[PDB]
């Protein structure tokens, strides 16, 4: 049981760092760029319609 816990501790320590490292930046940058493009893309039709 000690060899199994010592074997699983490295995989949990690797997955805990990789899952926290690779998770946030792609969805954060893609969501911020998608909302940033969707804001001006939504406002441009209202500005052209008002003009």
């Amino acid at each position: 049981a000690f060899i199994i816990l010592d074997e699983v501790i490295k995989v949990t320590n690797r997955r805990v760092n990789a899952i926290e490292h690779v998770i946030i930046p792609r969805t954060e940058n893609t969501i911020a760029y998608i909302n940033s493009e969707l804001d001006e893309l939504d406002r441009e039709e209202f500005y052209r319609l008002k003009k």
Binding site: N35, D39, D42, R43, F46, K50
Partner: protein, 457 residues
Amino acid sequence: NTVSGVNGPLVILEKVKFPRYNEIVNLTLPDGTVRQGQVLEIRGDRAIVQVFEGTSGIDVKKTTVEFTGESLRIPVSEDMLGRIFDGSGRPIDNGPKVFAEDYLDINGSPINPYARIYPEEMISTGVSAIDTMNSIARGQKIPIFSASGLPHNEIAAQICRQAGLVRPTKDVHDGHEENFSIVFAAMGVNLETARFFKQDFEENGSLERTSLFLNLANDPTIERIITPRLALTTAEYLAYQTERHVLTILTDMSSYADALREVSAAREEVPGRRGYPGYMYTDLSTIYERAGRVEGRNGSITQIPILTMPNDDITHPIPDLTGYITEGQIFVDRQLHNKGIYPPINVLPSLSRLMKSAIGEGMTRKDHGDVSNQLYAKYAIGKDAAAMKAVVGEEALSIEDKLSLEFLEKFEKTFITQGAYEDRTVFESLDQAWSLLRIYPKEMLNRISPKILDEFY
């Protein structure tokens, strides 16, 4: 003169200098139906006003002009409570005129009723978790975050029906012994919700002390947007005239934001991003301007706005602008309502600004913040131990995680759970928090004094 044209909800009338700003006008048609409206925009040799009765059916070569001579105002008196009226400012009770001797404008108070001091005395809303964990004082803006999956109208009706009952126990406790009033304004609600709110409020006995504002979804957006100004002006006039604490409930803010967004395309001003108008901060700030302690130190105007989201998304500008002006907010969880809790409100995502100073003296105890801090820490530790208990297992959990997990279900089904007509006070919520916190040992609580902890263990 004659009607120039009509396009959508706006009506083009021939007027040079006859109608004033906010002056009511009457259109005389030859079909036997007369309609009245308010001048939303005045220009030179033209008039753009929205009629409150109907949205079409007016002639362009047969209409007449009539001047009423009275601006759009709400009559504030002592007989407005205990009656049902419309959103435009007319009664619907089928009786005599309930107009009072005081006329106030719906575009702001002209007496400067803005507060200049921090609120000390707390106000009870009839909720144990909303009073203990996120309780607000007199003259504080605390909104209720809702969604499209829970009964936000029943949650506002439960807070309106539960309010006004703790004032007798607080007056008996040597606290708030003054008269209390309630401002009820409904915008974008159905007839079944208004009849269920009036029948539910009439059973508990709070309909006589409160005012009923009926605004349907088939009416104009100008009446629904002008409906909260009559309740805020009546609550400010009653709170300033009589020196009494008035708590106003405005539901829903999504119907007022949709009515203001619908009128943003009719005017010459262009709307902002996401379809809504860019001047929603001034419109929400105008309704939020009537808030704070009244002059005299004996009255205050409390406002409890209700905001409903489509999917609980914070990307809309209504949640950032509405939450930025208010000092905190209470969000309703969807998992608590599906689990069976009523009202399913979570204390982890909610936040209260100035929670250590929003508790008075003589009606609330001093250990409410210390018991609410240990109850919030035990609720967060039970929320973390509940999700960690499934991954860890039943034989690999911590010793404090089991008692915190049982205290999360017992505190969630004992403190958060409550009936629709069950009134509670600060002493009952403080006794329930001490009874729910009695399962934990003395070495697990350090956010309270030893005298109050050992005395009420």
